[PDB]
Amino acid sequence: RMKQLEDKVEELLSKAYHLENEVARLKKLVG
Amino acid sequence: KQLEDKVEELLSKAYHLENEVARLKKLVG
Amino acid sequence: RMKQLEDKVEELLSKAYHLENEVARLKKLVG
């Protein structure tokens, strides 16, 4: 279970990462 | 709309994970 | 191990609140 939650926080930090990228692109696009 | 829904999801998955982590904490100290 | 998982969770939750607030900011900017 410890490994399960460690793998889950990494997955979600990765997702956050890509979303922050999308936020930056949206900001550019909406000018 | 696609970003709204993914952040909605992230927020629910992160809150769920926080609860599980807190439970695991009780076991491990 | 435990404290590293807890820290990463806090990292994540702050990230997700910031994303939540950026989404709101963008919705407004799109009109």
Swiss-Prot record, chain B:
Coiled-coil intervals, chain numbering: none
Recorded phenotype for the gene knockout or disruption: Abolishes recruitment of the mediator complex to the upstream activating sequence (UAS) of amino-acid starvation responsive genes. Decreases RNA level of genes involved in amino acid biosynthesis and cofactor biosynthesis during amino acid starvation or methyl methanesulfonate stress. Growth dependent on amino acid supplementation. Sensitive to amino acid starvation. Sensitive to purine starvation. Decreases cellular glycogen levels during glucose starvation.
Compartments reported by the entry: Nucleus
Region of interest (Leucine-zipper), residue spans: 3-24
PTM field: Phosphorylated by the cyclin-CDK PCL5-PHO85.
Induction comment: Translation is induced by amino acid or purine starvation, or during growth in low or poor carbon sources. Translational repression during nutrient-rich conditions is dependent on four uORFs (upstream open reading frames) present in the 5'-UTR of the mRNA; these promote ribosome dissociation. Translational induction occurs in conditions reducing translation machinery efficiency, leading to ribosomes scanning over the uORFs, and increased translation of the mRNA. The rapid translational induction is followed by transcriptional induction at later time-points, independently of the uORF sequences.
TM regions (residue ranges): none
Role played: Master transcriptional regulator that mediates the response to amino acid starvation. Binds variations of the DNA sequence 5'-ATGA[CG]TCAT-3' in canonical nucleosome-depleted 5'-positioned promoters, and also within coding sequences and 3' non-coding regions. During nutrient starvation (low or poor amino acid, carbon or purine sources), it activates genes required for amino acid biosynthesis and transport, autophagy, cofactor biosynthesis and transport, mitochondrial transport, and additional downstream transcription factors.
Subunit structure: Homodimer. Each subunit binds overlapping and non-identical half-sites that flank the central CG base-pair in the pseudo-palindromic motif 5'-ATGA[CG]TCAT-3'. Interacts with the mediator tail; the interaction with GAL11/MED15 is direct. Interacts with the SAGA histone acetyltransferase complex. Interacts with the SWI/SNF chromatin remodeling complex.
The record's note on its domains: Residues 89 to 100 and 106 to 125 define the N-terminal activation domain (NTAD) and the central acidic activation domain (CAAD) respectively, which can function independently to promote high-level transcription of the target genes.
Similarity annotation: Belongs to the bZIP family. GCN4 subfamily.
Protein name as annotated: General control transcription factor GCN4
Organism of origin: Saccharomyces cerevisiae (strain ATCC 204508 / S288c)
Shown residues within the full chain: 251 to 279 of 281
